[PDB]
Every structure is written in C-alpha cells, then in structure tokens.
mmCIF file of C-alpha atoms in Angstrom:
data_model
loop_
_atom_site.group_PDB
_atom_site.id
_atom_site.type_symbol
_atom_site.label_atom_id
_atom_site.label_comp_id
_atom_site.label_asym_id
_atom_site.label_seq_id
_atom_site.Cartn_x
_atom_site.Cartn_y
_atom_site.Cartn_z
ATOM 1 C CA UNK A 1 58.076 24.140 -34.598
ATOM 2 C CA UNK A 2 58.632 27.052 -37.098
ATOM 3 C CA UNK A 3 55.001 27.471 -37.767
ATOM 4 C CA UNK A 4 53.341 30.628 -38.492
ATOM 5 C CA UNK A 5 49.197 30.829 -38.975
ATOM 6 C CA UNK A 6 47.828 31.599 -42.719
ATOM 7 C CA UNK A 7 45.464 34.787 -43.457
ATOM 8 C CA UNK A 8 42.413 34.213 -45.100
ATOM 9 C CA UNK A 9 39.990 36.253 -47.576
ATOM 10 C CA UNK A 10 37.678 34.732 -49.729
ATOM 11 C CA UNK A 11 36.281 37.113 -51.742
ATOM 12 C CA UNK A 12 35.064 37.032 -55.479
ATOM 13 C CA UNK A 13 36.659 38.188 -58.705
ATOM 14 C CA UNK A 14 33.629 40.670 -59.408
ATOM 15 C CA UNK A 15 31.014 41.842 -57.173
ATOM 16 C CA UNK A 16 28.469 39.169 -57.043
ATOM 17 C CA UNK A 17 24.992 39.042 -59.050
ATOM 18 C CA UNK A 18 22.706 35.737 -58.272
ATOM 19 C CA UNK A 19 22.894 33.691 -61.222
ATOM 20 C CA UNK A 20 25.527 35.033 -63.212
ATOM 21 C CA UNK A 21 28.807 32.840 -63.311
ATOM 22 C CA UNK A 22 31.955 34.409 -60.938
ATOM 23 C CA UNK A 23 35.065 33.350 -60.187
ATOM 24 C CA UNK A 24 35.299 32.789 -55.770
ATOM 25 C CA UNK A 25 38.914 33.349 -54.889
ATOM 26 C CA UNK A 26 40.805 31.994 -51.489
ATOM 27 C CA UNK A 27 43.721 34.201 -50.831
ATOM 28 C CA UNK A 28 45.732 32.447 -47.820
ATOM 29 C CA UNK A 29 49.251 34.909 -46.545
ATOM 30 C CA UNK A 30 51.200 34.925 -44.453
ATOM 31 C CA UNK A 31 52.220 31.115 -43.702
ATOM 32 C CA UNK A 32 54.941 29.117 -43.520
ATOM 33 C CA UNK A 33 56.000 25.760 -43.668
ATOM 34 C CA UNK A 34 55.357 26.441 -47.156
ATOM 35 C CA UNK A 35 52.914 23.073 -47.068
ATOM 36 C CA UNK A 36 49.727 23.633 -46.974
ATOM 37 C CA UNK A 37 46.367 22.097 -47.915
ATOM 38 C CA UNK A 38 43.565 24.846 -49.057
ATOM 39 C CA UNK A 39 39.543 23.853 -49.520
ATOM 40 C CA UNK A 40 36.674 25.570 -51.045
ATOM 41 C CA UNK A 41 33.423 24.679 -50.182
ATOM 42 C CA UNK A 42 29.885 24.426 -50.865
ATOM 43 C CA UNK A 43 27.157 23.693 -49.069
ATOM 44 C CA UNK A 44 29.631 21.884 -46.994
ATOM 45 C CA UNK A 45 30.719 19.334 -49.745
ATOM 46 C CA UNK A 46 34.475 20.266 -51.150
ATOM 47 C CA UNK A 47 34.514 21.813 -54.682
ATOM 48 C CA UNK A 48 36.235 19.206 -56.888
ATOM 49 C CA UNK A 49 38.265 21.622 -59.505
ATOM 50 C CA UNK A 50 39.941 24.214 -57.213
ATOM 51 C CA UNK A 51 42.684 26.066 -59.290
ATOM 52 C CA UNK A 52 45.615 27.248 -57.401
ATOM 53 C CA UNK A 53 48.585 29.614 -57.670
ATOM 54 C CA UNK A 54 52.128 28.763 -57.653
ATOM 55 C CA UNK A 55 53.904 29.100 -54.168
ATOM 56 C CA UNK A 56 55.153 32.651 -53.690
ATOM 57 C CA UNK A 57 56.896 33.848 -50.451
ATOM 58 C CA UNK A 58 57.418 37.690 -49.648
ATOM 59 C CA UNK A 59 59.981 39.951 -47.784
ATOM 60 C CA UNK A 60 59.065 38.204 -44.382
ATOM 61 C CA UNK A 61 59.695 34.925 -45.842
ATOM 62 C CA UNK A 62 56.060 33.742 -45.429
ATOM 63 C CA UNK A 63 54.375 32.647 -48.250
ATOM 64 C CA UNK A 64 50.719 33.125 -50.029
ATOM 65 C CA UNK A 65 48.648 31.030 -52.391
ATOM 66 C CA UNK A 66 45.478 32.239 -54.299
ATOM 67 C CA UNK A 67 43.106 29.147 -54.250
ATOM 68 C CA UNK A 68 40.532 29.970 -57.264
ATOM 69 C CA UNK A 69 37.549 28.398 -58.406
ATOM 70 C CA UNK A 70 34.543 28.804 -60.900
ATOM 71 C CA UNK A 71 30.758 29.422 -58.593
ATOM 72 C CA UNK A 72 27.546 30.753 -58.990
ATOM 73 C CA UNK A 73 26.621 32.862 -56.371
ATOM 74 C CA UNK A 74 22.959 32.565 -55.705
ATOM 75 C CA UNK A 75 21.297 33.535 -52.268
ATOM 76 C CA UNK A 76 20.476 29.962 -50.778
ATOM 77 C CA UNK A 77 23.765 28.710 -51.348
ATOM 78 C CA UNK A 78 26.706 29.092 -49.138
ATOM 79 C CA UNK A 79 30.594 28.913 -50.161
ATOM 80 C CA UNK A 80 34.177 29.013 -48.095
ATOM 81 C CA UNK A 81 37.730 27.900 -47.438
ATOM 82 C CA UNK A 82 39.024 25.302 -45.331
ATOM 83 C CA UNK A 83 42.414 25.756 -44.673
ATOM 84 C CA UNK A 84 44.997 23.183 -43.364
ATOM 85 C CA UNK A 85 48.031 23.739 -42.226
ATOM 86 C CA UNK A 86 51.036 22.714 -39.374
ATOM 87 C CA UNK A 87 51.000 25.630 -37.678
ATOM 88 C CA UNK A 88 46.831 25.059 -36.544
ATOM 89 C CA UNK A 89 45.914 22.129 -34.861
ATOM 90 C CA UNK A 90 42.875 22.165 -36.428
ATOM 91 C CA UNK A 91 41.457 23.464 -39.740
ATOM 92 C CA UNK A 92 40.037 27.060 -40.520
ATOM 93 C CA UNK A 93 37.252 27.132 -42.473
ATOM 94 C CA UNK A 94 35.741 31.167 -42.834
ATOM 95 C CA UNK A 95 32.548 31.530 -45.361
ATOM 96 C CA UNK A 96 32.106 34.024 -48.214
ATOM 97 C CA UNK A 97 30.297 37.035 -47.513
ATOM 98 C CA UNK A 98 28.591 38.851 -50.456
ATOM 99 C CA UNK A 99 29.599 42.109 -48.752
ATOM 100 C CA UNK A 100 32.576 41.854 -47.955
ATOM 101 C CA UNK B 1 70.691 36.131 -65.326
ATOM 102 C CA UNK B 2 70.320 34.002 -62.044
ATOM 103 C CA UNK B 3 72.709 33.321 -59.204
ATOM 104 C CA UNK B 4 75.832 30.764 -59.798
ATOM 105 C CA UNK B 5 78.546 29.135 -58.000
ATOM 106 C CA UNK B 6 79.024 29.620 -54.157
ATOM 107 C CA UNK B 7 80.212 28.144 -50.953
ATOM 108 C CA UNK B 8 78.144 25.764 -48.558
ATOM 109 C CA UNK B 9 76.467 26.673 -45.433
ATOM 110 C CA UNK C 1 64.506 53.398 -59.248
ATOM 111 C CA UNK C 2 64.564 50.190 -60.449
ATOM 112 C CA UNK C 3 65.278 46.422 -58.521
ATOM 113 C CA UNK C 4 66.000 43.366 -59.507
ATOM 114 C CA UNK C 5 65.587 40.050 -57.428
ATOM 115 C CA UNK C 6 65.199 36.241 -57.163
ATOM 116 C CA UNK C 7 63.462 34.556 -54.189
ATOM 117 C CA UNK C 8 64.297 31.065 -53.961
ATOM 118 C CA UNK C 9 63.370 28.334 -51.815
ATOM 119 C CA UNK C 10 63.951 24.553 -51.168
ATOM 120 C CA UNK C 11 62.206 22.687 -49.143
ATOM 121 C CA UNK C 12 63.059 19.041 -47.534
ATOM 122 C CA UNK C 13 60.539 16.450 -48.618
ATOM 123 C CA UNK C 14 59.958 13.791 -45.565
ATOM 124 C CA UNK C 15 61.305 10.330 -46.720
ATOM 125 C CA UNK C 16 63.862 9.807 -48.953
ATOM 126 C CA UNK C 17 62.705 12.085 -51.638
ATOM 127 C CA UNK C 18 64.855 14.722 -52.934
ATOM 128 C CA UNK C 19 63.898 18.644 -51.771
ATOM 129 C CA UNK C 20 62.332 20.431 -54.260
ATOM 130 C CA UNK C 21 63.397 23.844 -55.614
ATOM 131 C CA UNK C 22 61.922 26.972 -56.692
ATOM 132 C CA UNK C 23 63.209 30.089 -58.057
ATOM 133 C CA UNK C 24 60.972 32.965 -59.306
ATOM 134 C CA UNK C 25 62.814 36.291 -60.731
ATOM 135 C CA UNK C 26 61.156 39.252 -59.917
ATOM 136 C CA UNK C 27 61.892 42.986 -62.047
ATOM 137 C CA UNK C 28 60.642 45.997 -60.579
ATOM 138 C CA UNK C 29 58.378 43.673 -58.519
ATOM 139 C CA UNK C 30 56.856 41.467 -61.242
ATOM 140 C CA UNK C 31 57.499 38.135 -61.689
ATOM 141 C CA UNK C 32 59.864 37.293 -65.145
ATOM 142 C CA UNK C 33 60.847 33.989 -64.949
ATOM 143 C CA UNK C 34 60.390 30.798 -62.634
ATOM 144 C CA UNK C 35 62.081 27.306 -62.040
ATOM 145 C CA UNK C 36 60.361 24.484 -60.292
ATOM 146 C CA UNK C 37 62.041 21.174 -59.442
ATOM 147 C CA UNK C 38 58.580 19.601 -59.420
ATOM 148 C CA UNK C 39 57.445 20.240 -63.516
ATOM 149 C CA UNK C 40 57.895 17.610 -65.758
ATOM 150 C CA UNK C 41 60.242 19.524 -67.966
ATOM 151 C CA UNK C 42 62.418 21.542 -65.192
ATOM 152 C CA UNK C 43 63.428 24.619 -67.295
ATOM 153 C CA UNK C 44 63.435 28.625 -66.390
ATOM 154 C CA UNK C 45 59.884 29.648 -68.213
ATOM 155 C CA UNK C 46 59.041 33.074 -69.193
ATOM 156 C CA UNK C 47 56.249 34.791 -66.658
ATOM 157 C CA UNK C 48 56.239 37.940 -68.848
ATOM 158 C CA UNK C 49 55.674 38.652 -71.933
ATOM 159 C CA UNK C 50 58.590 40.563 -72.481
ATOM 160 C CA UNK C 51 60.688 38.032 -71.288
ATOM 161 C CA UNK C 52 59.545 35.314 -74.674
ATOM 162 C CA UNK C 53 62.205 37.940 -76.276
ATOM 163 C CA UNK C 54 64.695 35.517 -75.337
ATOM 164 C CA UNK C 55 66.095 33.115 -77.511
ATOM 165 C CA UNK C 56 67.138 29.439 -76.176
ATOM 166 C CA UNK C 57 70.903 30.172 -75.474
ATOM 167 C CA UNK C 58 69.155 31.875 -72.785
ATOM 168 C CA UNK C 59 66.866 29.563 -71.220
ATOM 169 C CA UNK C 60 69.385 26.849 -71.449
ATOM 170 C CA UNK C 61 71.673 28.731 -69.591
ATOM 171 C CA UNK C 62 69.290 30.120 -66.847
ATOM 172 C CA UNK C 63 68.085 26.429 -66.369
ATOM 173 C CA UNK C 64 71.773 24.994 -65.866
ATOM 174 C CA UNK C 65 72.302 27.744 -63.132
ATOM 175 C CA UNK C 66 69.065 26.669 -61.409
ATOM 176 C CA UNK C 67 69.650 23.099 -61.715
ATOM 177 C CA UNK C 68 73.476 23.511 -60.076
ATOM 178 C CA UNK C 69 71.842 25.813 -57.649
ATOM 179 C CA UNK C 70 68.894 22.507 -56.801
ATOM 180 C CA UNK C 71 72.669 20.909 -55.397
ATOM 181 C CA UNK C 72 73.685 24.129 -53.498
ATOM 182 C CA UNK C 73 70.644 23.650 -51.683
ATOM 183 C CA UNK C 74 70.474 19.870 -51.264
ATOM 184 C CA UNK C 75 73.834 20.180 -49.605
ATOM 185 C CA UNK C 76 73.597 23.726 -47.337
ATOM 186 C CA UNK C 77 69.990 22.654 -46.339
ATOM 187 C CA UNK C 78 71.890 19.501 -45.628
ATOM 188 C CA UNK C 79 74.614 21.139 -43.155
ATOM 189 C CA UNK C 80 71.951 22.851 -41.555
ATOM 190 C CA UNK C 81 70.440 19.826 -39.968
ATOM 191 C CA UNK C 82 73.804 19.107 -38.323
ATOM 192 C CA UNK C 83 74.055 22.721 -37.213
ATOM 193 C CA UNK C 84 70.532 22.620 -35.782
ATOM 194 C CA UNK C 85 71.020 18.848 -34.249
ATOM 195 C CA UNK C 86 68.021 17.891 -36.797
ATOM 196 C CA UNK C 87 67.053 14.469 -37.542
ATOM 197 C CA UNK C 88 66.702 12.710 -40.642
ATOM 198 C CA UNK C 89 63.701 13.549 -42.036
ATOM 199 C CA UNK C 90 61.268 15.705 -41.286
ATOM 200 C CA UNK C 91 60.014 19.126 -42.834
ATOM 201 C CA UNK C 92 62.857 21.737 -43.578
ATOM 202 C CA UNK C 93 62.488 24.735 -45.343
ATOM 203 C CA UNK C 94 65.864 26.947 -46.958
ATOM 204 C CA UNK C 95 65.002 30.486 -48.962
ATOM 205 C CA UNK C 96 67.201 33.217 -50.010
ATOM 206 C CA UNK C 97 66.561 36.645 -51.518
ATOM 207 C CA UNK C 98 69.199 38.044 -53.807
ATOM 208 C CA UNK C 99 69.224 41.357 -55.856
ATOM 209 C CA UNK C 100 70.098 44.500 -56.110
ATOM 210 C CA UNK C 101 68.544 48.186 -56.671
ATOM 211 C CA UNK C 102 69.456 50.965 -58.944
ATOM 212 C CA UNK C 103 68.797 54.453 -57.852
ATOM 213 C CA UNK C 104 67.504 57.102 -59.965
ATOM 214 C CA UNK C 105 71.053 57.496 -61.625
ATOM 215 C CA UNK C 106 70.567 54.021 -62.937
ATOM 216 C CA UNK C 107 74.003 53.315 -61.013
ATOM 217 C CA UNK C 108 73.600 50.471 -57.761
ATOM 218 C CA UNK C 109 72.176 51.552 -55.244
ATOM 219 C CA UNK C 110 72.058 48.469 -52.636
ATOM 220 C CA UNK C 111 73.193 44.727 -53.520
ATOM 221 C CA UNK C 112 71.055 42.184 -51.166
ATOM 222 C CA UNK C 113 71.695 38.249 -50.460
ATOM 223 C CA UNK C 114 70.281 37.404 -47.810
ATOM 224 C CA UNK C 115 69.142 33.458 -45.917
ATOM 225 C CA UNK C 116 66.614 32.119 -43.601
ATOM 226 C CA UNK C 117 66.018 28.555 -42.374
ATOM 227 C CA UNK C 118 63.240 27.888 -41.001
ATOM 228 C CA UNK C 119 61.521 31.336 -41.939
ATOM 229 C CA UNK C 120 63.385 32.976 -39.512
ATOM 230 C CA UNK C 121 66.996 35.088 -40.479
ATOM 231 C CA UNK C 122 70.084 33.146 -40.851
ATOM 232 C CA UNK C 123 72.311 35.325 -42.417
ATOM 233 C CA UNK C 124 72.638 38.270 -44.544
ATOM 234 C CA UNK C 125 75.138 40.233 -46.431
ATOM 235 C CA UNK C 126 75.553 43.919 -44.943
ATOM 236 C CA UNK C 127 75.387 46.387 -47.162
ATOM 237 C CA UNK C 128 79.042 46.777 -47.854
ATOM 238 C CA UNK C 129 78.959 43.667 -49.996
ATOM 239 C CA UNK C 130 81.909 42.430 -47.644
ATOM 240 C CA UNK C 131 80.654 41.298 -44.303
ATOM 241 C CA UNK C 132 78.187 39.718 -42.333
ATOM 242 C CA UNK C 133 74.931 39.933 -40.135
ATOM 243 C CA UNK C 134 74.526 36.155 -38.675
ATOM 244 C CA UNK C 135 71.243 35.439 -37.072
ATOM 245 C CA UNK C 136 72.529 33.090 -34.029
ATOM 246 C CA UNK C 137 75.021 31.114 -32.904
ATOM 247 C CA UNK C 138 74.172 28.727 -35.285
ATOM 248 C CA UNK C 139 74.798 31.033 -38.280
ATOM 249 C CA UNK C 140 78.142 31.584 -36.825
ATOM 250 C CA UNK C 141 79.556 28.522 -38.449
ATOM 251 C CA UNK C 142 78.417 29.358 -41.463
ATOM 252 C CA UNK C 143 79.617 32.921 -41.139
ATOM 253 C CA UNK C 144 83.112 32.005 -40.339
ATOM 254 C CA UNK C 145 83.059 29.227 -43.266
ATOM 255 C CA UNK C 146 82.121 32.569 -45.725
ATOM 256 C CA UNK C 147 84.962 34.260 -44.250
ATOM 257 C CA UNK C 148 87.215 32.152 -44.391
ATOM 258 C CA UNK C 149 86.049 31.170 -48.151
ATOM 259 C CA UNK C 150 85.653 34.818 -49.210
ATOM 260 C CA UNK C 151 82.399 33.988 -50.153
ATOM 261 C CA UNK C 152 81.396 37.871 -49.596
ATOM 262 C CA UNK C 153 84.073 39.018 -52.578
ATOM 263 C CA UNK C 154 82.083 36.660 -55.000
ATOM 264 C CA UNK C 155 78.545 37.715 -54.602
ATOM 265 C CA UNK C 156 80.130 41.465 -55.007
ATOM 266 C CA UNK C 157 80.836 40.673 -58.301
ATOM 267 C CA UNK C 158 77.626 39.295 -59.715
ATOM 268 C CA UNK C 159 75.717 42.031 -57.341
ATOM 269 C CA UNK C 160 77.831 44.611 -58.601
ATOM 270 C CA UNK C 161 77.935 43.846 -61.969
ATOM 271 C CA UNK C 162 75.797 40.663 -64.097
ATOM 272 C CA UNK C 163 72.775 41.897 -61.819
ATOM 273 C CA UNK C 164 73.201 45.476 -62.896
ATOM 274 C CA UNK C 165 74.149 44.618 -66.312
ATOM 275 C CA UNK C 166 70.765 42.379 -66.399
ATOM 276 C CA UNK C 167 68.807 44.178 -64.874
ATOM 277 C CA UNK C 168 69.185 47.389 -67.344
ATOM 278 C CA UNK C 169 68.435 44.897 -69.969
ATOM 279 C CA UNK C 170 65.345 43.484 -68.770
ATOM 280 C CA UNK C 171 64.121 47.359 -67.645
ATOM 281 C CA UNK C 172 64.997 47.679 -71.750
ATOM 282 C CA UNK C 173 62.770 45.284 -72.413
ATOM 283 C CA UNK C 174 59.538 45.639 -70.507
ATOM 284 C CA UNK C 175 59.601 48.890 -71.139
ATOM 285 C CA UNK C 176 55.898 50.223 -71.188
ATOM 286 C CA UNK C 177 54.526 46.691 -70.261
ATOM 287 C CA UNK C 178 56.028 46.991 -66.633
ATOM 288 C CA UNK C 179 55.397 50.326 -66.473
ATOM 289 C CA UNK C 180 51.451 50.151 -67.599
ATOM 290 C CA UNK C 181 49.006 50.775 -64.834
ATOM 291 C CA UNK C 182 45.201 49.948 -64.402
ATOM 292 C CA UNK C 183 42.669 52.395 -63.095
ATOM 293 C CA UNK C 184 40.637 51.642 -60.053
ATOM 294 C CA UNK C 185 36.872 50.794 -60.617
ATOM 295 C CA UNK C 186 35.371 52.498 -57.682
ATOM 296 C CA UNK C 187 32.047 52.076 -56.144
ATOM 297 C CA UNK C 188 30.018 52.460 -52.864
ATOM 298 C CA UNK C 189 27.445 49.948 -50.698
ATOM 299 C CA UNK C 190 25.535 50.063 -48.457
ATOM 300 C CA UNK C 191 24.522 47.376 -45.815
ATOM 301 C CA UNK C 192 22.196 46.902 -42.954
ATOM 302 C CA UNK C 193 21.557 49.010 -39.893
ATOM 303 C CA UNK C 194 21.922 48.462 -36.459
ATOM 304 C CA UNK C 195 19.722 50.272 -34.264
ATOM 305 C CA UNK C 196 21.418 53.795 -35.500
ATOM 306 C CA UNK C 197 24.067 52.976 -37.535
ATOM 307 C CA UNK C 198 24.470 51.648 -41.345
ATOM 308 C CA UNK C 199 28.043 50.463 -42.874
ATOM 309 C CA UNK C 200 29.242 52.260 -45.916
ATOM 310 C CA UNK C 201 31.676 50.009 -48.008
ATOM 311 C CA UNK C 202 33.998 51.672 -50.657
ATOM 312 C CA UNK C 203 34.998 49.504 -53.236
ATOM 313 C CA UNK C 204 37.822 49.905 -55.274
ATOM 314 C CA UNK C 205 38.186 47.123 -57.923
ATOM 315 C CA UNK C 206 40.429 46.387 -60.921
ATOM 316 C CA UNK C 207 43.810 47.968 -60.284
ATOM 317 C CA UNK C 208 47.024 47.575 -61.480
ATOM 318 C CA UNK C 209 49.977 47.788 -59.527
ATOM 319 C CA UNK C 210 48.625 47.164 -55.729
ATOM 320 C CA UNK C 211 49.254 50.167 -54.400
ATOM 321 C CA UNK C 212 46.276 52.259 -53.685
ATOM 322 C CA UNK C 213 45.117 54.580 -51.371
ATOM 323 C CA UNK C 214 41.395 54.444 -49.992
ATOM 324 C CA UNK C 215 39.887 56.768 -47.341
ATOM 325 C CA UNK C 216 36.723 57.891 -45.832
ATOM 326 C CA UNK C 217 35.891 61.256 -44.830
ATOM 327 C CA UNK C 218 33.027 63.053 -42.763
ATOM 328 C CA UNK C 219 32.462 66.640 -43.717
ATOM 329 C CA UNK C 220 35.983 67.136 -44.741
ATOM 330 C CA UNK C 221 37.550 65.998 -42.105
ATOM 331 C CA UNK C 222 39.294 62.937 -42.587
ATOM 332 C CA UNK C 223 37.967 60.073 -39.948
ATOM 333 C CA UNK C 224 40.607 57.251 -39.357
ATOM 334 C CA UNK C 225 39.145 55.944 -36.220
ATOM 335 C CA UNK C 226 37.273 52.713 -36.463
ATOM 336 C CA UNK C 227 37.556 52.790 -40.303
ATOM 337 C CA UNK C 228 37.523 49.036 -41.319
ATOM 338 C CA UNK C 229 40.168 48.246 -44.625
ATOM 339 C CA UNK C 230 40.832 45.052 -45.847
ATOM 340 C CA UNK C 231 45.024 43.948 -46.775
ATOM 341 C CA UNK C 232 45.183 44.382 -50.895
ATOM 342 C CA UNK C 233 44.152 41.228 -52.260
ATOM 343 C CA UNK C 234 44.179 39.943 -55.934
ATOM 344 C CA UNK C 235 41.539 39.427 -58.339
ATOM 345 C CA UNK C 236 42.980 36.919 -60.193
ATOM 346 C CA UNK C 237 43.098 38.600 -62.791
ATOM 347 C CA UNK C 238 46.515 40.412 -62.623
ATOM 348 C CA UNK C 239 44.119 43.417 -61.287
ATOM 349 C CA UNK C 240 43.614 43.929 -57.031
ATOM 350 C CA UNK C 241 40.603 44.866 -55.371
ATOM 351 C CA UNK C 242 40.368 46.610 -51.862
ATOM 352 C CA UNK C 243 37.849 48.172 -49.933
ATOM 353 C CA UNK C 244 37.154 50.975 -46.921
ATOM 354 C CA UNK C 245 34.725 50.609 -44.693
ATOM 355 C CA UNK C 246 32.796 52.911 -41.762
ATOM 356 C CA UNK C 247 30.500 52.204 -39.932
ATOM 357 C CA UNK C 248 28.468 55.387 -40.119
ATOM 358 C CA UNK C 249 25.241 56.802 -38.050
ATOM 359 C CA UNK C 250 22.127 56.456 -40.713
ATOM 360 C CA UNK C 251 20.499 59.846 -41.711
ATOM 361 C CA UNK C 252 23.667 61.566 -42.453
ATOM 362 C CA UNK C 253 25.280 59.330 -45.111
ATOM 363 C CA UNK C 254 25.580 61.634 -47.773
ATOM 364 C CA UNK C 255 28.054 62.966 -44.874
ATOM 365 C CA UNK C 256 30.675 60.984 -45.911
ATOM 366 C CA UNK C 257 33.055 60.829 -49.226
ATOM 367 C CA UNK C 258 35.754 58.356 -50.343
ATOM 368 C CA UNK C 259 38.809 58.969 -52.147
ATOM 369 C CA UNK C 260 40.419 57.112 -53.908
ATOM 370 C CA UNK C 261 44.402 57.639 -54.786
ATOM 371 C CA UNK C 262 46.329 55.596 -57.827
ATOM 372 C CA UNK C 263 48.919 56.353 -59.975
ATOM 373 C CA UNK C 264 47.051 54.950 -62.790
ATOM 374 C CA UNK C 265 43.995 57.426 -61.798
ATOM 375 C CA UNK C 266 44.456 61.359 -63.624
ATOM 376 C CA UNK C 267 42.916 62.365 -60.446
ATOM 377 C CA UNK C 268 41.750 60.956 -57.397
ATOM 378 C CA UNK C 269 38.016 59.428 -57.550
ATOM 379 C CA UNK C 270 35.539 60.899 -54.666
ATOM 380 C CA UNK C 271 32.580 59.295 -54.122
ATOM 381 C CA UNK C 272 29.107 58.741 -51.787
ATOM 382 C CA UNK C 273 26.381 57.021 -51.341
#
C-alpha cells in the first residue's frame, strides 16, 4: 500500500559523440518500497552488466539509485530504462535522448 | 560515532 | 554551519529471512561511512577518504553499534506489525534520521531523531530533546512507551554531546576535502525548430557540490515563464550536471544569455548561442 512512483532521467556522463565510448546513466528518485528492479536497454534487448549504486534515501524518506552502464552512442542505435517497481502496475521504460 | 542503546517501539 | 547525520533503514525480507540493515553516515552532507547487513564481511567501511584516518579500534567499535542496532530494528520493526494489525510476512520498511547541527559558533544548534514506517512519519523528537511529535494513533503507543522509558533523556545525551564531540572531529578531518568544490563546465545547444521557434539548452556539467543556479534571460530581463530545468542529477562521477532550457522564437537567439551561479565559480559564467 505505501507505494510511491520512481523519477526517471537517463542521461549520459558526457555529452554524447557517435562512436566514442560514454558512460549512459539511469537516475531513478523518489521511490519507496525501497525494492526495486531497474533495466537499461538497447535496441530493446536488456544490457547484461548494468552497475548500480547503493540504496540511498533522502529527507522525504524516498529513496534513489543511479543505474550505470558502459554504451556507445551512435545514431541508429537506441538506449533506455525499464523500471519496475510496486508502486506501478506496470513497468516504465523512457528512452535516452541525445539532447536532453 | 553511530547511535547505541535505546528502547523498543 | 556544520551537520552531522546517519540515515538508517531496515527493511523486512518476505519469508523467513532476516531484515536487512543499512546505515550510511553523512558529514556536512557527504557520505563517511556505511553498514550493510547484506556484504559478506558486515563492517562500517570508510566512504571518504578522510575517514581511512581511522585506525581499527574504530571500525570495530562502529560495527558492534550497527550490528546491536540490526536487533533494535528486528524487534521495533517487529512491534510495529502488531501496532499496524500486519501479517506475517510481507514487505515492511523502518528508517530513522538522527543528527544534529552546529551553528556558526560551532556550539549545537538542533539535535534530530526522527522515525517513519512505511515512508510516512511515525515519530519524531521535538526540538527540545525532551518530548514528542507522534504521527497517529498508532505512534501513540510507542510515544507513551518513550515516556514512560525516558527514552527522550538518552538520545539528549548522545545528541548533545558524542554527536557534537564527533562531529568536530570528523569536520577536523576532512578539512579541505569536504570543503573542495568543482567548477561548472558550461555550454549552449541548439535544437530543431518548430514552425517559429528553436530550443536553446544550457548545459552546465561537472560540478561539485549540487547546488547550482542556472537561468535564462532575454534582453536583460530575466524570463522564468515556460523555462524548462531538469532536477540536479549526478554524473557518476562525484560531479552533477543540469541544464536550462527555453524554448525561444528563431531569429533573435543571440537575444538570450545564461548564467550560471556556483560557489566553486570566481564569477558567474554568461553565455549564448
């Protein structure tokens, strides 16, 4: 019942250049249960290594993970995050946007 | 230092 | 002024497994130190470089106080499910915040300690260090328990006093580390029309603490309405990024400057397209 909805950004480390290697970041805030189940994606198949923070909560008591991973942004290919959580009855999946 | 000893909810 | 605080949290695992505890120690708003029920090797680790200063006496010490404090919560978050008619096992989460500021006198300014179950309020401890601010009528048992314990008397001490006394410590010890700051990275872009219009995006990238201060202007005059900004978000790093955004009417970019305000900055950046 105590559910509240997760905020998503995913954004890259540096500003993108096709080609050169980057680091594609997934910043979810602003949840809570504090379990939680964060994707990145690619081309719509699930990046295998995604590095993630350790579980941080803030003044409100909701908490915030940075989901990381290592990508290549080129201009055919297309990443995001998937985000699952209690409070959703289904997932949230928004795309990387070079600029933004 | 961390927080020690204290009564139950 | 300086603050000192520890946000833990333990959350009830669904089965038979016992909930698992975190504590994270934050100084002047950077993490110090952490605990985590879940590691292989439960111990309070260093999340500063400052903080390797310590020798084991330390650690071990910090680590027994977490590990008593894994009980305190396996027992409380245990009472709560009675208090709250809960069943036996299902997803339960416990977190308190505990600290205490110093003013610019270096003397206390405010001792905190403070619940929620559930992230919503349970109970807190009023500024007076003596009584108490319980969320519902299910904190009220709890409440009552604390006054009848005295429980308030007990956290004045270590508020009043080991927090203080630690906290000077660590400010002694991260001196110039905590106090470093990174200078925004600025930059402009520029993105695709529609049918009179173009979007002007002012990055700001590589900064070091959060705060920063980004704003678009037209002419002078300072235009806040529709401006698009995006909530500080982290690198990755240890540096944040941010960015302003306008919408503005093609032709007359060069119309339009960004500022760009941070304490690590000798003066504020302007820039345009």
């Amino acid at each position: 019942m105590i559910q509240k909805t997760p905020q998503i950004q995913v954004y890259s480390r540096h500003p993108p250049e096709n080609g050169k290697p980057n680091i594609l970041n997934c910043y979810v805030t602003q949840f809570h249960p504090p379990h939680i189940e964060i994707q990145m994606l690619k081309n719509g198949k699930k990046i295998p290594k995604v590095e993630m923070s350790d579980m941080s909560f803030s003044k409100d008591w909701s908490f915030y993970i940075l989901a990381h991973t290592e990508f290549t942004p080129t201009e055919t290919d297309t990443y995001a995050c998937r985000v699952k959580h209690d409070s959703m009855a289904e997932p949230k999946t928004v795309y990387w946007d070079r600029d933004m | 230092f961390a927080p020690g000893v204290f009564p139950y909810m | 002024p300086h603050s000192m605080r520890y946000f833990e949290t333990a959350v009830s695992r669904p089965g038979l497994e016992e909930p698992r505890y975190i504590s994270v120690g934050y100084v002047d708003n950077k993490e110090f130190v952490r605990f985590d029920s879940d590691a292989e090797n439960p111990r309070y680790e260093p999340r500063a470089p400052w903080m390797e200063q310590e020798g084991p006496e330390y650690w071990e010490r910090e680590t027994q106080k977490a590990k008593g404090q894994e009980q305190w919560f396996r027992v409380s978050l245990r009472n709560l499910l009675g208090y709250y008619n809960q069943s036996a096992g299902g997803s339960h989460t416990l977190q308190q915040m505990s600290g205490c500021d110093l003013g610019s006198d270096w003397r206390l300014l405010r001792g905190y300690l403070q619940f929620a179950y559930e992230g919503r309020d349970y109970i807190a401890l009023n500024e007076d260090l003596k009584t108490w601010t319980a969320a519902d009528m299910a904190a009220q048992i709890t409440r009552r328990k604390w006054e009848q314990s005295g429980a308030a008397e007990h956290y004045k001490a270590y508020l009043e006093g080991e927090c203080v006394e630690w906290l000077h410590r660590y400010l002694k010890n991260g001196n110039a580390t905590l106090l470093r700051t990174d200078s925004p990275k600025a930059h402009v872009t520029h993105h695709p029309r529609s049918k009179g219009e173009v979007t002007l995006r002012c990055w700001a990238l590589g900064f070091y603490p959060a705060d920063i201060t980004l704003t678009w202007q037209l002419n002078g005059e300072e235009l806040t309405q529709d401006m698009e900004l995006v909530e500080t978000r982290p690198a990755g790093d240890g540096t944040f990024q941010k960015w302003a955004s306008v919408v503005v009417p093609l032709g007359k970019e060069q119309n339009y400057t960004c500022r760009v305000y941070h304490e690590g900055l000798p003066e504020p950046l302007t820039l345009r397209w």
